[PDB]
């Protein structure tokens, strides 16, 4: 599951490791208005 | 297989000697008798 | 054939076999690292034509 822009161009020491601080959702916009 | 070698000792002097120059010319004889690397 | 030089060959030919064993260590060494070489190599190639592409 590959978030964000999915084009066919993407396609292509003992310390404890934190994970990185990414969200699992983006904010989208629809307008249906004029 | 030379004189000197049979004037040190034995005939099978000689075999190991010869042995070891079939093998690879005395290259390890020479270098681990003597530390010289004949073929660096 | 006789009776001394079958001792002196099979004598000789254990020495041998030693010497080429450890010989044959060595370039097994020399082969793996060739390969590995070779292989990380090929994979940037790879990765460069990848990035080609997509420029």
């Known amino acids: 599951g590959q978030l964000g822009i999915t084009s066919p161009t993407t396609a292509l020491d003992g310390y404890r490791r934190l994970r990185p601080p990414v969200v699992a959702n983006l904010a989208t916009v629809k307008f249906t208005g004029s | 297989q030379t004189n000197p070698f049979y004037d040190i000792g034995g005939v099978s002097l000689q075999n190991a000697i010869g042995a070891n120059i079939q093998a690879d010319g005395a290259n390890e004889l020479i270098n681990f008798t003597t530390g010289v690397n004949t073929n660096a | ?55």
Do not use: F
């Open chain 3, 1 to 55: 054939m006789g009776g001394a030089a079958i001792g002196g060959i099979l004598g000789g030919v254990q020495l041998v076999a030693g010497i080429s064993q450890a010989n044959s260590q060595a370039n097994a060494q020399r082969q793996s690292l060739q390969a590995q070489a070779q292989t990380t190599v090929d994979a940037s190639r790879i990765r460069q034509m990848e990035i080609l592409q997509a420029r």
